[PDB]
Design a protein around this nucleic acid. Structure first.
Ligand code: ZN
Ligand code: ZN
Length: 45
DNA sequence: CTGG
């Protein structure tokens, strides 16, 4: 879809789809033990 | 925009 992947960089898909290795922690937030949104990725408030 |  002409989108660069969060942790792989290659386009035509998204992080999870990319064959390359996945990020251990949250992509947007970094932390570990959850998805991307669940963690303080963007001031949950 | 896209999400594990
Ligand atoms: Zn990728
Ligand atoms: Zn996080």
């Amino acid at each position: 879809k002409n989108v660069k992947c969060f942790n792989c960089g290659k386009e035509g898909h998204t992080a999870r789809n990319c064959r390359a290795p996945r990020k251990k922690g949250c992509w947007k937030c970094g932390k570990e033990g959850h998805q991307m949104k669940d963690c303080t990725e963007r001031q949950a408030n």
